[PDB]
PDB file of C-alpha atoms and ligand atoms in Angstrom:
ATOM      1  CA  UNK A   1       0.000   0.000   0.000  1.00  0.00           C
ATOM      2  CA  UNK A   2       2.842   2.316   0.959  1.00  0.00           C
ATOM      3  CA  UNK A   3       5.230   3.397  -1.808  1.00  0.00           C
ATOM      4  CA  UNK A   4       8.946   3.503  -1.021  1.00  0.00           C
ATOM      5  CA  UNK A   5      11.871   4.588  -3.170  1.00  0.00           C
ATOM      6  CA  UNK A   6      15.352   3.138  -3.550  1.00  0.00           C
ATOM      7  CA  UNK A   7      18.066   4.831  -5.610  1.00  0.00           C
ATOM      8  CA  UNK A   8      19.023   2.581  -8.556  1.00  0.00           C
ATOM      9  CA  UNK A   9      21.991   4.316 -10.199  1.00  0.00           C
ATOM     10  CA  UNK A  10      20.462   7.718  -9.622  1.00  0.00           C
ATOM     11  CA  UNK A  11      16.924   6.707 -10.573  1.00  0.00           C
ATOM     12  CA  UNK A  12      14.551   6.947  -7.617  1.00  0.00           C
ATOM     13  CA  UNK A  13      12.744   3.650  -8.158  1.00  0.00           C
ATOM     14  CA  UNK A  14       9.291   3.360  -6.612  1.00  0.00           C
ATOM     15  CA  UNK A  15       8.359  -0.010  -5.135  1.00  0.00           C
ATOM     16  CA  UNK A  16       6.198  -1.860  -2.638  1.00  0.00           C
ATOM     17  CA  UNK A  17       7.766  -4.692  -0.590  1.00  0.00           C
ATOM     18  CA  UNK A  18       5.402  -7.355  -1.952  1.00  0.00           C
ATOM     19  CA  UNK A  19       6.616  -6.453  -5.486  1.00  0.00           C
ATOM     20  CA  UNK A  20      10.283  -6.614  -4.465  1.00  0.00           C
ATOM     21  CA  UNK A  21      12.141  -9.588  -5.932  1.00  0.00           C
ATOM     22  CA  UNK A  22      15.690  -8.618  -4.996  1.00  0.00           C
ATOM     23  CA  UNK A  23      16.523  -6.479  -8.027  1.00  0.00           C
ATOM     24  CA  UNK A  24      17.708  -3.578  -5.907  1.00  0.00           C
ATOM     25  CA  UNK A  25      20.167  -5.929  -4.153  1.00  0.00           C
ATOM     26  CA  UNK A  26      21.711  -8.797  -6.165  1.00  0.00           C
ATOM     27  CA  UNK A  27      20.407  -7.189  -9.339  1.00  0.00           C
ATOM     28  CA  UNK A  28      23.106  -4.590  -8.751  1.00  0.00           C
ATOM     29  CA  UNK A  29      25.453  -7.192 -10.263  1.00  0.00           C
ATOM     30  CA  UNK A  30      23.997  -6.251 -13.685  1.00  0.00           C
ATOM     31  CA  UNK A  31      25.612  -2.801 -14.181  1.00  0.00           C
ATOM     32  CA  UNK A  32      29.313  -3.808 -13.830  1.00  0.00           C
ATOM     33  CA  UNK A  33      28.809  -7.049 -15.779  1.00  0.00           C
ATOM     34  CA  UNK A  34      26.888  -5.497 -18.667  1.00  0.00           C
ATOM     35  CA  UNK A  35      29.365  -2.604 -18.792  1.00  0.00           C
ATOM     36  CA  UNK A  36      32.359  -4.953 -19.112  1.00  0.00           C
ATOM     37  CA  UNK A  37      30.898  -7.524 -21.507  1.00  0.00           C
ATOM     38  CA  UNK A  38      28.466  -5.554 -23.737  1.00  0.00           C
ATOM     39  CA  UNK A  39      29.000  -1.892 -23.205  1.00  0.00           C
ATOM     40  CA  UNK A  40      26.076   0.362 -24.005  1.00  0.00           C
ATOM     41  CA  UNK A  41      23.339  -1.220 -26.090  1.00  0.00           C
ATOM     42  CA  UNK A  42      20.721   0.721 -28.077  1.00  0.00           C
ATOM     43  CA  UNK A  43      17.585  -1.157 -26.958  1.00  0.00           C
ATOM     44  CA  UNK A  44      17.432  -3.037 -23.654  1.00  0.00           C
ATOM     45  CA  UNK A  45      14.404  -4.855 -22.247  1.00  0.00           C
ATOM     46  CA  UNK A  46      13.861  -6.085 -18.687  1.00  0.00           C
ATOM     47  CA  UNK A  47      11.518  -9.021 -18.655  1.00  0.00           C
ATOM     48  CA  UNK A  48       9.655  -9.868 -15.409  1.00  0.00           C
ATOM     49  CA  UNK A  49      10.561  -6.328 -14.543  1.00  0.00           C
ATOM     50  CA  UNK A  50       8.427  -5.645 -11.456  1.00  0.00           C
ATOM     51  CA  UNK A  51       9.594  -2.227 -10.196  1.00  0.00           C
ATOM     52  CA  UNK A  52      12.564  -2.577 -12.666  1.00  0.00           C
ATOM     53  CA  UNK A  53      15.415  -1.982 -10.184  1.00  0.00           C
ATOM     54  CA  UNK A  54      17.646  -3.707 -12.760  1.00  0.00           C
ATOM     55  CA  UNK A  55      16.409  -1.840 -15.841  1.00  0.00           C
ATOM     56  CA  UNK A  56      16.419   1.621 -14.270  1.00  0.00           C
ATOM     57  CA  UNK A  57      19.948   0.935 -12.987  1.00  0.00           C
ATOM     58  CA  UNK A  58      21.195  -0.005 -16.454  1.00  0.00           C
ATOM     59  CA  UNK A  59      19.548   3.147 -17.788  1.00  0.00           C
ATOM     60  CA  UNK A  60      20.831   5.232 -14.870  1.00  0.00           C
ATOM     61  CA  UNK A  61      24.385   4.069 -15.625  1.00  0.00           C
ATOM     62  CA  UNK A  62      23.982   4.880 -19.355  1.00  0.00           C
ATOM     63  CA  UNK A  63      24.170   1.237 -20.440  1.00  0.00           C
ATOM     64  CA  UNK A  64      21.208   1.591 -22.801  1.00  0.00           C
ATOM     65  CA  UNK A  65      19.809   4.264 -25.096  1.00  0.00           C
ATOM     66  CA  UNK A  66      16.224   3.118 -24.690  1.00  0.00           C
ATOM     67  CA  UNK A  67      14.917   0.994 -21.850  1.00  0.00           C
ATOM     68  CA  UNK A  68      11.729  -1.021 -22.126  1.00  0.00           C
ATOM     69  CA  UNK A  69      10.031  -2.911 -19.303  1.00  0.00           C
ATOM     70  CA  UNK A  70       7.455  -5.658 -19.199  1.00  0.00           C
ATOM     71  CA  UNK A  71       5.684  -7.657 -16.475  1.00  0.00           C
ATOM     72  CA  UNK A  72       2.480  -9.696 -16.168  1.00  0.00           C
ATOM     73  CA  UNK A  73       1.364  -8.008 -12.927  1.00  0.00           C
ATOM     74  CA  UNK A  74      -0.519  -4.791 -13.675  1.00  0.00           C
ATOM     75  CA  UNK A  75       0.402  -3.320 -10.267  1.00  0.00           C
ATOM     76  CA  UNK A  76       4.034  -3.831 -11.216  1.00  0.00           C
ATOM     77  CA  UNK A  77       3.499  -2.124 -14.588  1.00  0.00           C
ATOM     78  CA  UNK A  78       1.933   0.884 -12.870  1.00  0.00           C
ATOM     79  CA  UNK A  79       4.558   1.316 -10.156  1.00  0.00           C
ATOM     80  CA  UNK A  80       7.100   1.146 -12.969  1.00  0.00           C
ATOM     81  CA  UNK A  81       5.342   3.897 -14.899  1.00  0.00           C
ATOM     82  CA  UNK A  82       5.140   6.065 -11.772  1.00  0.00           C
ATOM     83  CA  UNK A  83       8.952   5.786 -11.613  1.00  0.00           C
ATOM     84  CA  UNK A  84       9.298   6.841 -15.284  1.00  0.00           C
ATOM     85  CA  UNK A  85       7.183   9.926 -14.611  1.00  0.00           C
ATOM     86  CA  UNK A  86       8.807  10.866 -11.274  1.00  0.00           C
ATOM     87  CA  UNK A  87      12.262  10.685 -12.878  1.00  0.00           C
ATOM     88  CA  UNK A  88      11.321  12.407 -16.139  1.00  0.00           C
ATOM     89  CA  UNK A  89      12.344   9.369 -18.175  1.00  0.00           C
ATOM     90  CA  UNK A  90       9.252   9.383 -20.403  1.00  0.00           C
ATOM     91  CA  UNK A  91      11.074   9.864 -23.702  1.00  0.00           C
ATOM     92  CA  UNK A  92      13.379   6.875 -23.088  1.00  0.00           C
ATOM     93  CA  UNK A  93      11.197   4.214 -21.402  1.00  0.00           C
ATOM     94  CA  UNK A  94       8.169   2.091 -22.276  1.00  0.00           C
ATOM     95  CA  UNK A  95       6.294  -0.252 -19.931  1.00  0.00           C
ATOM     96  CA  UNK A  96       4.193  -3.136 -21.276  1.00  0.00           C
ATOM     97  CA  UNK A  97       1.638  -5.243 -19.441  1.00  0.00           C
ATOM     98  CA  UNK A  98       2.102  -8.696 -20.907  1.00  0.00           C
ATOM     99  CA  UNK A  99       2.464 -12.366 -20.105  1.00  0.00           C
ATOM    100  CA  UNK A 100       5.944 -12.958 -21.503  1.00  0.00           C
ATOM    101  CA  UNK A 101       5.614 -11.569 -25.067  1.00  0.00           C
ATOM    102  CA  UNK A 102       1.913 -12.347 -25.744  1.00  0.00           C
ATOM    103  CA  UNK A 103       0.779  -8.697 -25.699  1.00  0.00           C
ATOM    104  CA  UNK A 104       4.033  -6.850 -26.341  1.00  0.00           C
ATOM    105  CA  UNK A 105       3.965  -4.742 -29.566  1.00  0.00           C
ATOM    106  CA  UNK A 106       4.704  -7.245 -32.312  1.00  0.00           C
ATOM    107  CA  UNK A 107       7.386  -5.124 -33.973  1.00  0.00           C
ATOM    108  CA  UNK A 108       9.433  -4.632 -30.783  1.00  0.00           C
ATOM    109  CA  UNK A 109      12.841  -6.303 -30.858  1.00  0.00           C
ATOM    110  CA  UNK A 110      15.814  -5.741 -28.512  1.00  0.00           C
ATOM    111  CA  UNK A 111      19.608  -5.964 -28.582  1.00  0.00           C
ATOM    112  CA  UNK A 112      19.785  -7.123 -24.940  1.00  0.00           C
ATOM    113  CA  UNK A 113      17.017  -8.723 -22.847  1.00  0.00           C
ATOM    114  CA  UNK A 114      17.755  -9.016 -19.123  1.00  0.00           C
ATOM    115  CA  UNK A 115      15.576 -10.317 -16.318  1.00  0.00           C
ATOM    116  CA  UNK A 116      15.185 -11.583 -12.718  1.00  0.00           C
ATOM    117  CA  UNK A 117      12.391 -14.124 -13.283  1.00  0.00           C
ATOM    118  CA  UNK A 118      10.534 -16.294 -10.768  1.00  0.00           C
ATOM    119  CA  UNK A 119      13.439 -18.417  -9.719  1.00  0.00           C
ATOM    120  CA  UNK A 120      12.076 -21.674  -8.365  1.00  0.00           C
ATOM    121  CA  UNK A 121      10.185 -24.620  -9.853  1.00  0.00           C
ATOM    122  CA  UNK A 122       8.011 -25.122  -6.792  1.00  0.00           C
ATOM    123  CA  UNK A 123       7.018 -28.605  -7.975  1.00  0.00           C
ATOM    124  CA  UNK A 124      10.541 -29.979  -7.497  1.00  0.00           C
ATOM    125  CA  UNK A 125      12.120 -27.463  -5.103  1.00  0.00           C
ATOM    126  CA  UNK A 126      13.128 -28.697  -1.633  1.00  0.00           C
ATOM    127  CA  UNK A 127      10.381 -28.406   0.959  1.00  0.00           C
ATOM    128  CA  UNK A 128      12.552 -26.102   3.066  1.00  0.00           C
ATOM    129  CA  UNK A 129      12.821 -23.744   0.079  1.00  0.00           C
ATOM    130  CA  UNK A 130       9.153 -23.463  -0.919  1.00  0.00           C
ATOM    131  CA  UNK A 131       8.087 -22.960   2.696  1.00  0.00           C
ATOM    132  CA  UNK A 132      10.540 -20.092   3.137  1.00  0.00           C
ATOM    133  CA  UNK A 133       8.851 -18.167   0.293  1.00  0.00           C
ATOM    134  CA  UNK A 134       5.218 -19.292   0.710  1.00  0.00           C
ATOM    135  CA  UNK A 135       5.140 -17.316   3.972  1.00  0.00           C
ATOM    136  CA  UNK A 136       7.089 -14.248   2.887  1.00  0.00           C
ATOM    137  CA  UNK A 137       6.378 -13.408  -0.743  1.00  0.00           C
ATOM    138  CA  UNK A 138       3.466 -13.453  -3.206  1.00  0.00           C
ATOM    139  CA  UNK A 139       3.576 -16.550  -5.373  1.00  0.00           C
ATOM    140  CA  UNK A 140       3.969 -14.415  -8.510  1.00  0.00           C
ATOM    141  CA  UNK A 141       7.357 -13.186  -7.257  1.00  0.00           C
ATOM    142  CA  UNK A 142       9.144 -16.515  -6.945  1.00  0.00           C
ATOM    143  CA  UNK A 143       7.226 -19.450  -8.447  1.00  0.00           C
ATOM    144  CA  UNK A 144       7.766 -20.969 -11.896  1.00  0.00           C
ATOM    145  CA  UNK A 145       5.966 -24.291 -11.546  1.00  0.00           C
ATOM    146  CA  UNK A 146       7.444 -26.837 -13.980  1.00  0.00           C
ATOM    147  CA  UNK A 147       9.529 -23.926 -15.413  1.00  0.00           C
ATOM    148  CA  UNK A 148       6.576 -23.037 -17.625  1.00  0.00           C
ATOM    149  CA  UNK A 149       7.175 -19.275 -17.574  1.00  0.00           C
ATOM    150  CA  UNK A 150      10.798 -19.921 -18.590  1.00  0.00           C
ATOM    151  CA  UNK A 151       9.630 -22.294 -21.354  1.00  0.00           C
ATOM    152  CA  UNK A 152       7.179 -19.847 -22.914  1.00  0.00           C
ATOM    153  CA  UNK A 153       9.828 -17.132 -22.628  1.00  0.00           C
ATOM    154  CA  UNK A 154      12.617 -19.061 -24.370  1.00  0.00           C
ATOM    155  CA  UNK A 155      10.201 -20.261 -27.039  1.00  0.00           C
ATOM    156  CA  UNK A 156       9.204 -16.640 -27.783  1.00  0.00           C
ATOM    157  CA  UNK A 157      12.461 -14.773 -27.329  1.00  0.00           C
ATOM    158  CA  UNK A 158      14.054 -15.827 -30.622  1.00  0.00           C
ATOM    159  CA  UNK A 159      11.970 -13.492 -32.741  1.00  0.00           C
ATOM    160  CA  UNK A 160      12.267 -10.647 -30.209  1.00  0.00           C
ATOM    161  CA  UNK A 161      16.039 -10.214 -30.586  1.00  0.00           C
ATOM    162  CA  UNK A 162      17.614  -7.726 -32.990  1.00  0.00           C
ATOM    163  CA  UNK A 163      20.412  -9.088 -35.214  1.00  0.00           C
ATOM    164  CA  UNK A 164      23.165  -9.963 -32.777  1.00  0.00           C
ATOM    165  CA  UNK A 165      20.933  -9.521 -29.737  1.00  0.00           C
ATOM    166  CA  UNK A 166      21.316 -11.732 -26.649  1.00  0.00           C
ATOM    167  CA  UNK A 167      19.454 -12.733 -23.481  1.00  0.00           C
ATOM    168  CA  UNK A 168      21.084 -12.373 -20.034  1.00  0.00           C
ATOM    169  CA  UNK A 169      19.015 -13.802 -17.188  1.00  0.00           C
ATOM    170  CA  UNK A 170      20.008 -13.719 -13.520  1.00  0.00           C
ATOM    171  CA  UNK A 171      19.162 -17.096 -11.921  1.00  0.00           C
ATOM    172  CA  UNK A 172      19.595 -18.713  -8.484  1.00  0.00           C
ATOM    173  CA  UNK A 173      22.036 -21.585  -7.875  1.00  0.00           C
ATOM    174  CA  UNK A 174      19.659 -22.778  -5.134  1.00  0.00           C
ATOM    175  CA  UNK A 175      16.790 -23.349  -7.543  1.00  0.00           C
ATOM    176  CA  UNK A 176      18.416 -24.097 -10.908  1.00  0.00           C
ATOM    177  CA  UNK A 177      21.625 -24.414 -12.875  1.00  0.00           C
ATOM    178  CA  UNK A 178      22.374 -24.122 -16.622  1.00  0.00           C
ATOM    179  CA  UNK A 179      21.666 -27.792 -17.338  1.00  0.00           C
ATOM    180  CA  UNK A 180      18.069 -27.393 -16.087  1.00  0.00           C
ATOM    181  CA  UNK A 181      17.378 -24.955 -18.959  1.00  0.00           C
ATOM    182  CA  UNK A 182      19.557 -26.442 -21.710  1.00  0.00           C
ATOM    183  CA  UNK A 183      16.857 -28.652 -23.315  1.00  0.00           C
ATOM    184  CA  UNK A 184      14.381 -25.780 -23.595  1.00  0.00           C
ATOM    185  CA  UNK A 185      17.103 -23.480 -24.889  1.00  0.00           C
ATOM    186  CA  UNK A 186      18.166 -25.969 -27.554  1.00  0.00           C
ATOM    187  CA  UNK A 187      14.546 -26.723 -28.520  1.00  0.00           C
ATOM    188  CA  UNK A 188      13.852 -23.011 -29.020  1.00  0.00           C
ATOM    189  CA  UNK A 189      16.757 -22.597 -31.449  1.00  0.00           C
ATOM    190  CA  UNK A 190      19.028 -20.850 -28.957  1.00  0.00           C
ATOM    191  CA  UNK A 191      22.285 -21.824 -27.245  1.00  0.00           C
ATOM    192  CA  UNK A 192      24.058 -21.105 -23.979  1.00  0.00           C
ATOM    193  CA  UNK A 193      26.860 -18.715 -24.943  1.00  0.00           C
ATOM    194  CA  UNK A 194      28.118 -18.379 -21.342  1.00  0.00           C
ATOM    195  CA  UNK A 195      27.507 -19.020 -17.635  1.00  0.00           C
ATOM    196  CA  UNK A 196      28.904 -16.406 -15.261  1.00  0.00           C
ATOM    197  CA  UNK A 197      28.549 -16.974 -11.516  1.00  0.00           C
ATOM    198  CA  UNK A 198      27.891 -13.661  -9.822  1.00  0.00           C
ATOM    199  CA  UNK A 199      30.644 -12.431  -7.571  1.00  0.00           C
ATOM    200  CA  UNK A 200      30.465 -11.896  -3.792  1.00  0.00           C
ATOM    201  CA  UNK A 201      28.222 -10.727  -2.175  1.00  0.00           C
ATOM    202  CA  UNK A 202      25.686 -12.076  -4.696  1.00  0.00           C
ATOM    203  CA  UNK A 203      27.225 -15.445  -5.452  1.00  0.00           C
ATOM    204  CA  UNK A 204      23.925 -17.197  -4.702  1.00  0.00           C
ATOM    205  CA  UNK A 205      23.105 -15.998  -8.250  1.00  0.00           C
ATOM    206  CA  UNK A 206      24.486 -16.562 -11.731  1.00  0.00           C
ATOM    207  CA  UNK A 207      24.031 -14.949 -15.121  1.00  0.00           C
ATOM    208  CA  UNK A 208      22.973 -16.981 -18.145  1.00  0.00           C
ATOM    209  CA  UNK A 209      24.002 -15.609 -21.534  1.00  0.00           C
ATOM    210  CA  UNK A 210      21.722 -17.064 -24.235  1.00  0.00           C
ATOM    211  CA  UNK A 211      21.534 -16.178 -27.933  1.00  0.00           C
ATOM    212  CA  UNK A 212      20.178 -17.675 -31.192  1.00  0.00           C
ATOM    213  CA  UNK A 213      22.006 -20.842 -32.176  1.00  0.00           C
ATOM    214  CA  UNK A 214      24.119 -21.103 -35.331  1.00  0.00           C
TER     215      UNK A 214
HETATM  216  N1  LIG B   1       4.498 -14.866 -17.236  1.00  0.00           N
HETATM  217  C1  LIG B   1       5.074 -13.729 -16.845  1.00  0.00           C
HETATM  218  N2  LIG B   1       5.344 -12.725 -17.766  1.00  0.00           N
HETATM  219  C2  LIG B   1       5.937 -11.542 -17.343  1.00  0.00           C
HETATM  220  N3  LIG B   1       6.266 -11.351 -16.002  1.00  0.00           N
HETATM  221  C3  LIG B   1       6.012 -12.338 -15.102  1.00  0.00           C
HETATM  222  C4  LIG B   1       5.420 -13.536 -15.506  1.00  0.00           C
HETATM  223  N4  LIG B   1       5.285 -14.311 -14.407  1.00  0.00           N
HETATM  224  C5  LIG B   1       5.773 -13.645 -13.330  1.00  0.00           C
HETATM  225  N5  LIG B   1       6.229 -12.422 -13.749  1.00  0.00           N
HETATM  226  C6  LIG B   1       6.855 -11.362 -12.939  1.00  0.00           C
HETATM  227  O1  LIG B   1       8.226 -11.657 -12.774  1.00  0.00           O
HETATM  228  C7  LIG B   1       8.730 -11.027 -11.615  1.00  0.00           C
HETATM  229  C8  LIG B   1       9.709 -11.960 -10.900  1.00  0.00           C
HETATM  230  S1  LIG B   1      10.138 -11.343  -9.253  1.00  0.00           S
HETATM  231  C9  LIG B   1      11.311 -10.116  -9.901  1.00  0.00           C
HETATM  232  C10 LIG B   1      10.806  -8.698  -9.648  1.00  0.00           C
HETATM  233  C11 LIG B   1      11.751  -7.581 -10.075  1.00  0.00           C
HETATM  234  N6  LIG B   1      12.231  -7.829 -11.434  1.00  0.00           N
HETATM  235  C12 LIG B   1      12.895  -7.461  -9.068  1.00  0.00           C
HETATM  236  O2  LIG B   1      14.075  -7.653  -9.418  1.00  0.00           O
HETATM  237  O3  LIG B   1      12.657  -7.175  -7.884  1.00  0.00           O
HETATM  238  C13 LIG B   1       7.502 -10.634 -10.796  1.00  0.00           C
HETATM  239  O4  LIG B   1       7.355  -9.235 -10.872  1.00  0.00           O
HETATM  240  C14 LIG B   1       6.325 -11.260 -11.519  1.00  0.00           C
HETATM  241  O5  LIG B   1       5.208 -10.410 -11.428  1.00  0.00           O
END
C-alpha cells in the first residue's frame, strides 16, 4: 500500500515490498557485468521487470539508449510507470503489461534482454525452500511451476532479438543451474553462450548468456 523509493543508479525507483524480488540488491550485479561484456546497447528490455530496479539501474548508468520494461502483474506495470514519470524518463522508457511476449507490440525487438524471473520450480524445489517463500512473498514473485514461464519465454524470445541480440538472465544456484534450462534453450533454437557466476556478495546468483544458435 505504501510506496517507497530506492536509488538505482540515480533513478529513484518506486516499489512496494510485496513487489520486491531482490533487483535492488543482487540485481546490482547487472551494471558492472553489462558494462564490461556488452557496453552500451541501443535497446534493452527487462523481462519480469516488477519495479525494474535492474532496468532503471542499467539506464541510470547509461548502459542503454532506450529501456523497455514488461511484467504480467498490472500493479508492477503501474509502479514502474510512476517511476518513469517521477524521474522524467518518459522519452526513453516504455512499460508493457504482458504475459511474456503475448501482448508486447509485435514489432518490438531488442539488442539485450535481461531479467530476474521467478526463480524456483516449486514442484521440485526442496520443501525447506518453498516454505521459506510461501510465507514471505506473493507466489507471482518466486514461483515458476514446472519452469513453464521460462519455457514460454525461451520459445518466444528468438523473434524478439535484434540481429546480434542476446538474453542475459540472472538465476539462483539454489533453484536451478544451466543444465536445467539447456533442453528448452536448444529446442527453441538458442544456445548457452556463457555461464557467469555472480561475484560476492551475490554469489547465490548466476548470469545466463543465451543467444540464437548457429
Ligand atoms: N508470465 C510472466 N510474464 C511476465 N512477467 C512475469 C510472468 N510471471 C511472473 N512475472 C513477474 O516476474 C517477476 C519476478 S520477481 C522479480 C521482480 C523484479 N524484477 C525485481 O528484481 O525485484 C515478478 O514481478 C512477476 O510479477
